[PDB]
Write a protein that binds this DNA or RNA. Sequence first.
RNA 1: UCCCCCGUGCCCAUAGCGGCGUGGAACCACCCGUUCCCAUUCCGAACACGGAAGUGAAACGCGCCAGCGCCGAUGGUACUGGGCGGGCGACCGCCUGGGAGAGUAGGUCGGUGCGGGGGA
RNA 2: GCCAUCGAUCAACGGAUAAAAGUUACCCCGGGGAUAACAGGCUGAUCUCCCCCGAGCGUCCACAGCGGCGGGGAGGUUUGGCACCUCGAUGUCGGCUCGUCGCAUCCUGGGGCUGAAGAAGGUCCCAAGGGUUGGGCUGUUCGCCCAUUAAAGCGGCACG
RNA 3: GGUCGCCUCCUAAAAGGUAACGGAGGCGCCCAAAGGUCCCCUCAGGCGGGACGGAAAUCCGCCGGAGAGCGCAAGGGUAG
RNA 4: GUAGAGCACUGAUAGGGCUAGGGGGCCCACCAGCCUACCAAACCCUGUCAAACUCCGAAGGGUCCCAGGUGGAGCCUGGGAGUGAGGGCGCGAGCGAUAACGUCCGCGUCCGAGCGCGGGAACAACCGAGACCGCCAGCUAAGGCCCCCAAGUCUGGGCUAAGUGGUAAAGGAUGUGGCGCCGCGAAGACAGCCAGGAGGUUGGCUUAGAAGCAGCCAUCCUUUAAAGAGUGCGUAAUAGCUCACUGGUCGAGUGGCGCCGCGCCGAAAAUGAUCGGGGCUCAAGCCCAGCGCCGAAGCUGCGGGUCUGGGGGAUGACCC
Lengths: 110, 189, 84, 141
Amino acid sequence: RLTAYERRKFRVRNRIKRTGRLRLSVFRSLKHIYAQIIDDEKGVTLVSASSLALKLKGNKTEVARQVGRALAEKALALGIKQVAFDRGPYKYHGRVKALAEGAREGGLEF
Amino acid sequence: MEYRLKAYYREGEKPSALRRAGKLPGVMYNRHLNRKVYVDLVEFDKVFRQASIHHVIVLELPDGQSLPTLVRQVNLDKRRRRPEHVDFFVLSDEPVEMYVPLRFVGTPAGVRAGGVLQEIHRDILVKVSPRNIPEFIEVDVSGLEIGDSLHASDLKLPPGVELAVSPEETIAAVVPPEDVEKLAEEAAA
Amino acid sequence: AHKKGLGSTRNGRDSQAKRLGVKRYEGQVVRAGNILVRQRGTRFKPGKNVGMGRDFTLFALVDGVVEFQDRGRLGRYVHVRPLA
Amino acid sequence: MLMPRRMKYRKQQRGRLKGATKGGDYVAFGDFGLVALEPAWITAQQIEAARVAMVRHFRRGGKIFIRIFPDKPYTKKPLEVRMGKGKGNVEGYVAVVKPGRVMFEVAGVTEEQAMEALRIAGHKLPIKTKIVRRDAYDEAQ
RNA sequence: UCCCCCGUGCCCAUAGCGGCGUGGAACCACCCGUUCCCAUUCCGAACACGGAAGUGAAACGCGCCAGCGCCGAUGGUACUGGGCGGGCGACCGCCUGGGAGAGUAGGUCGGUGCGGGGGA
RNA sequence: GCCAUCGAUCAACGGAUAAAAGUUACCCCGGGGAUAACAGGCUGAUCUCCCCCGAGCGUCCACAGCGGCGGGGAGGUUUGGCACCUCGAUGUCGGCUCGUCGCAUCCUGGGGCUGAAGAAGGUCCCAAGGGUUGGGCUGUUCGCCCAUUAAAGCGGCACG
RNA sequence: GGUCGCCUCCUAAAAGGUAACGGAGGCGCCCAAAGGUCCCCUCAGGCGGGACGGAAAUCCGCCGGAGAGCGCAAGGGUAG
RNA sequence: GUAGAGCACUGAUAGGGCUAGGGGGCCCACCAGCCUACCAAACCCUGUCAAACUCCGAAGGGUCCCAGGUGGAGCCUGGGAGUGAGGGCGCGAGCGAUAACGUCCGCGUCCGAGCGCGGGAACAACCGAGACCGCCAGCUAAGGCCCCCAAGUCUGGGCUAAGUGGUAAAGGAUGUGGCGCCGCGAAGACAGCCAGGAGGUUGGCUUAGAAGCAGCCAUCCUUUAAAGAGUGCGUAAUAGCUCACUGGUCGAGUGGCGCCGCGCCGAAAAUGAUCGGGGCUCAAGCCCAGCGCCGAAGCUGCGGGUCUGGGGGAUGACCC
Ligand SMILES: [Mg+2]
Ligand SMILES: [Mg+2]
Ligand SMILES: [Mg+2]
Ligand SMILES: [Mg+2]
Ligand SMILES: [Mg+2]
Ligand SMILES: [Mg+2]
Ligand SMILES: [Mg+2]
Ligand SMILES: [Mg+2]
Ligand SMILES: [Mg+2]
Ligand SMILES: [Mg+2]
Ligand SMILES: [Mg+2]
Ligand SMILES: [Mg+2]
Ligand SMILES: [Mg+2]
Ligand SMILES: [Mg+2]
Ligand SMILES: [Mg+2]
Ligand SMILES: [Mg+2]
Ligand SMILES: [Mg+2]
Ligand SMILES: [Mg+2]
Ligand SMILES: [Mg+2]
Ligand SMILES: [Mg+2]
Ligand SMILES: [Mg+2]
Ligand SMILES: [Mg+2]
Ligand SMILES: [Mg+2]
Ligand SMILES: [Mg+2]
Ligand SMILES: [Mg+2]
Ligand SMILES: [Mg+2]
Ligand SMILES: [Mg+2]
Ligand SMILES: [Mg+2]
Ligand SMILES: [Mg+2]
Ligand SMILES: [Mg+2]
Ligand SMILES: [Mg+2]
Ligand SMILES: [Mg+2]
Ligand SMILES: [Mg+2]
Ligand SMILES: [Mg+2]
Ligand SMILES: [Mg+2]
Ligand SMILES: [Mg+2]
Ligand SMILES: [Mg+2]
Ligand SMILES: [Mg+2]
Ligand SMILES: [Mg+2]
Ligand SMILES: [Mg+2]
Ligand SMILES: [Mg+2]
Ligand SMILES: [Mg+2]
Ligand SMILES: [Mg+2]
Ligand SMILES: [Mg+2]
Ligand SMILES: [Mg+2]
Ligand SMILES: [Mg+2]
Ligand SMILES: [Mg+2]
Ligand SMILES: [Mg+2]
Ligand SMILES: [Mg+2]
Ligand SMILES: [Mg+2]
Ligand SMILES: [Mg+2]
Ligand SMILES: [Mg+2]
Ligand SMILES: [Mg+2]
Ligand SMILES: [Mg+2]
Ligand SMILES: [Mg+2]
Ligand SMILES: [Mg+2]
Ligand SMILES: [Mg+2]
Ligand SMILES: [Mg+2]
Ligand SMILES: [Mg+2]
Ligand SMILES: [Mg+2]
Ligand SMILES: [Mg+2]
Ligand SMILES: [Mg+2]
Ligand SMILES: [Mg+2]
Ligand SMILES: [Mg+2]
Ligand SMILES: [Mg+2]
Ligand SMILES: [Mg+2]
Ligand SMILES: [Mg+2]
Ligand SMILES: [Mg+2]
Ligand SMILES: [Mg+2]
Ligand SMILES: [Mg+2]
Ligand SMILES: [Mg+2]
Ligand SMILES: [Mg+2]
Ligand SMILES: [Mg+2]
Ligand SMILES: [Mg+2]
Ligand SMILES: [Mg+2]
Ligand SMILES: [Mg+2]
Ligand SMILES: [Mg+2]
Ligand SMILES: [Mg+2]
Ligand SMILES: [Mg+2]
Ligand SMILES: [Mg+2]
Ligand SMILES: [Mg+2]
Ligand SMILES: [Mg+2]
Ligand SMILES: [Mg+2]
Ligand SMILES: [Mg+2]
Ligand SMILES: [Mg+2]
Ligand SMILES: [Mg+2]
Ligand SMILES: [Mg+2]
Ligand SMILES: [Mg+2]
Ligand SMILES: [Mg+2]
Ligand SMILES: [Mg+2]
Ligand SMILES: [Mg+2]
Ligand SMILES: [Mg+2]
Ligand SMILES: [Mg+2]
Ligand SMILES: [Mg+2]
Ligand SMILES: [Mg+2]
Ligand SMILES: [Mg+2]
Ligand SMILES: [Mg+2]
Ligand SMILES: [Mg+2]
Ligand SMILES: [Mg+2]
Ligand SMILES: [Mg+2]
Ligand SMILES: [Mg+2]
Ligand SMILES: [Mg+2]
Ligand SMILES: [Mg+2]
Ligand SMILES: [Mg+2]
Ligand SMILES: [Mg+2]
Ligand SMILES: [Mg+2]
Ligand SMILES: [Mg+2]
Ligand SMILES: [Mg+2]
Ligand SMILES: [Mg+2]
Ligand SMILES: [Mg+2]
Ligand SMILES: [Mg+2]
Ligand SMILES: [Mg+2]
Ligand SMILES: [Mg+2]
Ligand SMILES: [Mg+2]
Ligand SMILES: [Mg+2]
Ligand SMILES: [Mg+2]
Ligand SMILES: [Mg+2]
Ligand SMILES: [Mg+2]
Ligand SMILES: [Mg+2]
Ligand SMILES: [Mg+2]
Ligand SMILES: [Mg+2]
Ligand SMILES: [Mg+2]
Ligand SMILES: [Mg+2]
Ligand SMILES: [Mg+2]
Ligand SMILES: [Mg+2]
Ligand SMILES: [Mg+2]
Ligand SMILES: [Mg+2]
Ligand SMILES: [Mg+2]
Ligand SMILES: [Mg+2]
Ligand SMILES: [Mg+2]
Ligand SMILES: [Mg+2]
Ligand SMILES: [Mg+2]
Ligand SMILES: [Mg+2]
Ligand SMILES: [Mg+2]
Ligand SMILES: [Mg+2]
Ligand SMILES: [Mg+2]
Ligand SMILES: [Mg+2]
Ligand SMILES: [Mg+2]
Ligand SMILES: [Mg+2]
Ligand SMILES: [Mg+2]
Ligand SMILES: [Mg+2]
Ligand SMILES: [Mg+2]
Ligand SMILES: [Mg+2]
Ligand SMILES: [Mg+2]
Ligand SMILES: [Mg+2]
Ligand SMILES: [Mg+2]
Ligand SMILES: [Mg+2]
Ligand SMILES: [Mg+2]
Ligand SMILES: [Mg+2]
Ligand SMILES: [Mg+2]
Ligand SMILES: [Mg+2]
Ligand SMILES: [Mg+2]
Ligand SMILES: [Mg+2]
Ligand SMILES: [Mg+2]
Ligand SMILES: [Mg+2]
Ligand SMILES: [Mg+2]
Ligand SMILES: [Mg+2]
Ligand SMILES: [Mg+2]
Ligand SMILES: [Mg+2]
Ligand SMILES: [Mg+2]
Ligand SMILES: [Mg+2]
Ligand SMILES: [Mg+2]
Ligand SMILES: [Mg+2]
Ligand SMILES: [Mg+2]
Ligand SMILES: [Mg+2]
Ligand SMILES: [Mg+2]
Ligand SMILES: [Mg+2]
Ligand SMILES: [Mg+2]
Ligand SMILES: [Mg+2]
Ligand SMILES: [Mg+2]
Ligand SMILES: [Mg+2]
Ligand SMILES: [Mg+2]
Ligand SMILES: [Mg+2]
Ligand SMILES: [Mg+2]
Ligand SMILES: [Mg+2]
Ligand SMILES: [Mg+2]
Ligand SMILES: [Mg+2]
Ligand SMILES: [Mg+2]
Ligand SMILES: [Mg+2]
Ligand SMILES: [Mg+2]
Ligand SMILES: [Mg+2]
Ligand SMILES: [Mg+2]
Ligand SMILES: [Mg+2]
Ligand SMILES: [Mg+2]
Ligand SMILES: [Mg+2]
Ligand SMILES: [Mg+2]
Ligand SMILES: [Mg+2]
Ligand SMILES: [Mg+2]
Ligand SMILES: [Mg+2]
Ligand SMILES: [Mg+2]
Ligand SMILES: [Mg+2]
Ligand SMILES: [Mg+2]
Ligand SMILES: [Mg+2]
Ligand SMILES: [Mg+2]
Ligand SMILES: [Mg+2]
Ligand SMILES: [Mg+2]
Ligand SMILES: [Mg+2]
Ligand SMILES: [Mg+2]
Ligand SMILES: [Mg+2]
Ligand SMILES: [Mg+2]
Ligand SMILES: [Mg+2]
Ligand SMILES: [Mg+2]
Ligand SMILES: [Mg+2]
Ligand SMILES: [Mg+2]
Ligand SMILES: [Mg+2]
Ligand SMILES: [Mg+2]
Ligand SMILES: [Mg+2]
Ligand SMILES: [Mg+2]
Ligand SMILES: [Mg+2]
Ligand SMILES: [Mg+2]
Ligand SMILES: [Mg+2]
Ligand SMILES: [Mg+2]
Ligand SMILES: [Mg+2]
Ligand SMILES: [Mg+2]
Ligand SMILES: [Mg+2]
Ligand SMILES: [Mg+2]
Ligand SMILES: [Mg+2]
Ligand SMILES: [Mg+2]
Ligand SMILES: [Mg+2]
Ligand SMILES: [Mg+2]
Ligand SMILES: [Mg+2]
Ligand SMILES: [Mg+2]
Ligand SMILES: [Mg+2]
Ligand SMILES: [Mg+2]
Ligand SMILES: [Mg+2]
Ligand SMILES: [Mg+2]
Ligand SMILES: [Mg+2]
Ligand SMILES: [Mg+2]
Ligand SMILES: [Mg+2]
Ligand SMILES: [Mg+2]
Ligand SMILES: [Mg+2]
Ligand SMILES: [Mg+2]
């Protein structure tokens, strides 16, 4: 048995995993949003940015933009520039979008 | 209802040899032990005929041990219809599952009516401690007419004994006989 | 004399053999492009450095060594580890 | 007359008869049974014939069990025709029996009664046979 | 470096179904609202956004129990690569190496990787 | 010409021509026992003969005489299957003539049982020494029929 | 008399391949959406409840891993 | 993904349970209560079957890497072919009839081309064995060792009495030897001997009496050391007369069932018979054990030929 939730997840995640790039995963809780970057070859998170960890607040979308930007800072430092965006079970829009838009001008190539 | 039977250990000796030497290869196990064994065939036979899975058999091991066992299973030569291996299940203080001989008593109303008692189950599987393993489990099959039947859900059960199957496991029934005049409409069919 | 009313046969045909199967095995060295598995449906799934053609053919995408894998419920996979 | 109600396929290849019986080697219902000693295709005519013989022997009484069933289609090309031009037609059904297979069983009839009835039955069968009594070994199986 | 939670892989049911219990500090979830972005072949159910009054009822996490499901020896046998023998013949049998399936004993209410948050 | 593309039940589908059916006992040549018909052989489904079972018949009584449903064989007379010798030839039915062998015996001989009173008959066993008619019909073998008879046997021998 | 090319399954003896006038079936088409992609959704069936309404029209609930669907025969594949 | 095995899928399947519906009777019908030694979907338990079923699954087979392997191995290029009727046997399948010196495939083998040699009487392809030539030398193989005919009338130990051996089945049998298990037994058994073995059978009945014994009619009760409304003979019938049966007697074994070895019957053909023959019976048959020997063109010894390779030659010629 499966929720449409889970089905979407696998469906969008698998497609990205095939392209073999680094993976920018995202979690979007009611109160926060989190974004880690994963090497699925080794199965390991290389760098992570989040609202909770940023001790951040001030409207979800505007917040989301920053965690992306912050994510790029720690990423580019390590050497990461090329990446693929795991949009999870979430429609590419609003909060998730803002995270991407931030992480974009933050320097990430995607 | 408690039998003895001398047993011996074994390792490399080929089963084939052991058999054409009139012994019967076997095994001896419970959650704690497991040992290759053999018994004398003709000696096992006379014992097992009486004891069966139903009654405890005590294995007299060479090292002076005397183990309570149930025969868990017996492997047959298909061609010859003749035993070729035994499983001895060493009893422990614990409760164990096992088959207990049903004993139908009273000649059914249907049998008198000319039918026949089909003894569907002849033993019934049961949870019970070793110290208190029953045997004869009576069943009043007397009220049973032709077309009737009784199930596990209708048994005596000595105290401390568990109906270890489905209650609805049908125990026995009474069936119409064979009859030469049935052949008529069987020919008219 | 002999040759009496015999009969006929309402069937009696077949298709050509299709030579399906695994074509390169685990541990075999392969050039990029090498056919790894001819199949019907995904009896095998494409893994690392392995692509799948329109008729489910599995081929190597890199020079490397062929490697098999049974991931239980997720199916069976053919990979190609590249070589350093 | 035994034969399948329905059939996935109408003609069936012959096959060999390797080994002892696959199973159905222990008495499972009555007190005495008839066991196959050599293998054969037992015709549906023979099954029925044995059946009737027992029935007739103990006229009204006891119950007969039949542990074999003819599901194999038996083919025969017409008389006086040559080889080729298709496979023959189905002309009956047999049950493939192998040594060790209990084929019949009886119950609720006296020991002597059972012995004669099962004995006559075997006389109808195209093979050597033996009668057997239900054992501790059978109930153990 | 022990404990709890969140995201995420790997092993692919010994991990599951079902039952009973536990958890809201934090996280997470249901929750509150439809102004804005977005949305419904109808419905703010879903997707989405702005929130934080309430609640762990649901969901989820963690436990516990073996009815189900799942896993499952040893021993023995079927079958068999190779080498042979008996019988007019149907078929049997021997040595050597390999060796199931079923069933018996029994196991199981998961185990582990990387990152994040919170503890003592 | 090159590029693109069209006209094929060329379906006997690797497609002989753009274009094609029969007949021969009036026949002919090259080959084949690589292949049929005769006969042999292997087989024995079919054929003939003999058994096992004992349901039931026989007033009564399974077995005097019978033998449901089924099962096991022998033979190598019939019709077949196969294609092994023979196609640089193994002449094919019936009749006649001359037979000879088999015995699963038609008669004669010796027996057992009988639902054997006697006379007869039935069934089985032994027995192959000898015997086993003349005509009408049809090419017939077979078969029917006339008149007899102890009997008017059946098969093998390339259906001698 | 039947057949003649192509496809699916068995025969086929656990790689490939494998014969017979062996056992079963199909094809000589089709679709401007039945194609490309992005996004979303998940069957069949059972039980219960529901005007006309039934075995079966459409709606609600619980169950359900795939027994449905995938133009067409069969096989393989397939709801991650 | 086969052999085996299994029923989880697709189908098949016998019995039972459970249970929609269907059928017969009841209530009687308008609807409902039906109850059912009937028919039966789904479902459950027992028990199975399948090339085109598989939850399972060997042995093997395939390919790759590493290692051994120097072989009338292998790989590349080119010149010359012939072959494209195969066959027998073993094994696995299809067809056939679980027929064929049948047919069609697959793996192997041999004949083909080894109709050369030993064995199997004789016999392409079964057993043994791959013939360069010579020998009046030796060892072995298969198969054999009584004579034809080379070698044991060898040595232990059993079985067989049919000439089984020396070619057949269901099935039939106090053949025979060997293992068992089961009752009987001197608390005197089995075998016979043996005093006994009255019926008020006034059989319920019977009719030219059809009073135990055509008449398959409760199918009585007695005296007990034991005697049946009868196991039978002269009868449609009285007499007669056996058996059951206890009783002694007798004195030591008897009855029934199962398994194994070897044998018996079932067992009829056509020119003259026969295991190849003679002939064979504590074998010259079968089985178990041992020690000898015979024997093929195989292997060995001696001589020679030729091909190839490697040496020699401290050179061809020649030599090992
Ligand atoms: Mg599921
Ligand atoms: Mg979805
Ligand atoms: Mg999806
Ligand atoms: Mg990993
Ligand atoms: Mg701020
Ligand atoms: Mg901006
Ligand atoms: Mg850049
Ligand atoms: Mg003792
Ligand atoms: Mg344990
Ligand atoms: Mg003993
Ligand atoms: Mg004790
Ligand atoms: Mg009574
Ligand atoms: Mg019933
Ligand atoms: Mg009928
Ligand atoms: Mg019928
Ligand atoms: Mg002909
Ligand atoms: Mg015709
Ligand atoms: Mg037709
Ligand atoms: Mg094909
Ligand atoms: Mg091809
Ligand atoms: Mg083919
Ligand atoms: Mg693709
Ligand atoms: Mg492919
Ligand atoms: Mg691997
Ligand atoms: Mg894995
Ligand atoms: Mg899966
Ligand atoms: Mg998957
Ligand atoms: Mg999948
Ligand atoms: Mg049926
Ligand atoms: Mg066979
Ligand atoms: Mg077997
Ligand atoms: Mg076998
Ligand atoms: Mg065997
Ligand atoms: Mg069987
Ligand atoms: Mg009974
Ligand atoms: Mg009775
Ligand atoms: Mg028989
Ligand atoms: Mg018995
Ligand atoms: Mg018994
Ligand atoms: Mg039982
Ligand atoms: Mg620690
Ligand atoms: Mg985890
Ligand atoms: Mg693991
Ligand atoms: Mg799971
Ligand atoms: Mg529960
Ligand atoms: Mg509980
Ligand atoms: Mg509680
Ligand atoms: Mg609790
Ligand atoms: Mg509590
Ligand atoms: Mg809070
Ligand atoms: Mg507002
Ligand atoms: Mg508005
Ligand atoms: Mg607006
Ligand atoms: Mg939009
Ligand atoms: Mg809008
Ligand atoms: Mg619309
Ligand atoms: Mg719209
Ligand atoms: Mg919970
Ligand atoms: Mg519990
Ligand atoms: Mg359990
Ligand atoms: Mg599993
Ligand atoms: Mg094992
Ligand atoms: Mg073993
Ligand atoms: Mg072997
Ligand atoms: Mg073998
Ligand atoms: Mg052999
Ligand atoms: Mg032999
Ligand atoms: Mg044998
Ligand atoms: Mg041997
Ligand atoms: Mg050996
Ligand atoms: Mg072994
Ligand atoms: Mg072995
Ligand atoms: Mg536990
Ligand atoms: Mg669990
Ligand atoms: Mg749990
Ligand atoms: Mg734990
Ligand atoms: Mg570790
Ligand atoms: Mg140009
Ligand atoms: Mg045409
Ligand atoms: Mg046309
Ligand atoms: Mg052509
Ligand atoms: Mg041309
Ligand atoms: Mg031309
Ligand atoms: Mg002229
Ligand atoms: Mg002319
Ligand atoms: Mg001629
Ligand atoms: Mg000739
Ligand atoms: Mg024939
Ligand atoms: Mg005929
Ligand atoms: Mg006979
Ligand atoms: Mg009568
Ligand atoms: Mg009489
Ligand atoms: Mg009678
Ligand atoms: Mg008779
Ligand atoms: Mg009749
Ligand atoms: Mg017959
Ligand atoms: Mg013949
Ligand atoms: Mg002939
Ligand atoms: Mg013939
Ligand atoms: Mg031929
Ligand atoms: Mg030939
Ligand atoms: Mg002429
Ligand atoms: Mg004349
Ligand atoms: Mg003549
Ligand atoms: Mg005579
Ligand atoms: Mg006479
Ligand atoms: Mg007479
Ligand atoms: Mg008279
Ligand atoms: Mg007669
Ligand atoms: Mg004579
Ligand atoms: Mg004469
Ligand atoms: Mg004569
Ligand atoms: Mg005349
Ligand atoms: Mg005339
Ligand atoms: Mg005339
Ligand atoms: Mg005529
Ligand atoms: Mg005449
Ligand atoms: Mg006369
Ligand atoms: Mg005449
Ligand atoms: Mg003559
Ligand atoms: Mg003739
Ligand atoms: Mg003639
Ligand atoms: Mg002839
Ligand atoms: Mg003649
Ligand atoms: Mg034509
Ligand atoms: Mg293959
Ligand atoms: Mg359309
Ligand atoms: Mg959408
Ligand atoms: Mg949608
Ligand atoms: Mg539905
Ligand atoms: Mg409904
Ligand atoms: Mg509806
Ligand atoms: Mg209407
Ligand atoms: Mg709906
Ligand atoms: Mg299905
Ligand atoms: Mg549908
Ligand atoms: Mg699916
Ligand atoms: Mg499907
Ligand atoms: Mg899945
Ligand atoms: Mg499989
Ligand atoms: Mg396959
Ligand atoms: Mg399944
Ligand atoms: Mg299927
Ligand atoms: Mg099915
Ligand atoms: Mg079914
Ligand atoms: Mg049933
Ligand atoms: Mg039923
Ligand atoms: Mg009704
Ligand atoms: Mg009525
Ligand atoms: Mg009415
Ligand atoms: Mg009324
Ligand atoms: Mg009514
Ligand atoms: Mg009305
Ligand atoms: Mg009315
Ligand atoms: Mg009722
Ligand atoms: Mg198959
Ligand atoms: Mg199969
Ligand atoms: Mg397994
Ligand atoms: Mg498994
Ligand atoms: Mg496997
Ligand atoms: Mg294995
Ligand atoms: Mg393997
Ligand atoms: Mg090497
Ligand atoms: Mg050429
Ligand atoms: Mg050529
Ligand atoms: Mg040619
Ligand atoms: Mg040829
Ligand atoms: Mg060849
Ligand atoms: Mg060959
Ligand atoms: Mg031969
Ligand atoms: Mg053969
Ligand atoms: Mg067969
Ligand atoms: Mg057969
Ligand atoms: Mg055959
Ligand atoms: Mg034959
Ligand atoms: Mg035959
Ligand atoms: Mg043959
Ligand atoms: Mg054959
Ligand atoms: Mg070959
Ligand atoms: Mg030769
Ligand atoms: Mg050769
Ligand atoms: Mg020659
Ligand atoms: Mg020779
Ligand atoms: Mg010779
Ligand atoms: Mg010979
Ligand atoms: Mg010759
Ligand atoms: Mg020959
Ligand atoms: Mg010769
Ligand atoms: Mg030759
Ligand atoms: Mg030989
Ligand atoms: Mg040999
Ligand atoms: Mg030597
Ligand atoms: Mg010598
Ligand atoms: Mg040898
Ligand atoms: Mg020798
Ligand atoms: Mg001699
Ligand atoms: Mg000689
Ligand atoms: Mg001599
Ligand atoms: Mg004799
Ligand atoms: Mg002789
Ligand atoms: Mg001899
Ligand atoms: Mg012979
Ligand atoms: Mg002979
Ligand atoms: Mg012989
Ligand atoms: Mg015999
Ligand atoms: Mg006897
Ligand atoms: Mg007897
Ligand atoms: Mg006797
Ligand atoms: Mg004997
Ligand atoms: Mg004893
Ligand atoms: Mg005793
Ligand atoms: Mg006795
Ligand atoms: Mg005793
Ligand atoms: Mg005493
Ligand atoms: Mg009398
Ligand atoms: Mg009378
Ligand atoms: Mg009385
Ligand atoms: Mg007088
Ligand atoms: Mg008197
Ligand atoms: Mg016994
Ligand atoms: Mg024995
Ligand atoms: Mg025995
Ligand atoms: Mg004989
Ligand atoms: Mg001789
Ligand atoms: Mg000789
Ligand atoms: Mg002689
Ligand atoms: Mg030589
Ligand atoms: Mg020499
Ligand atoms: Mg010379
Ligand atoms: Mg030389
Ligand atoms: Mg050298
Ligand atoms: Mg040199």
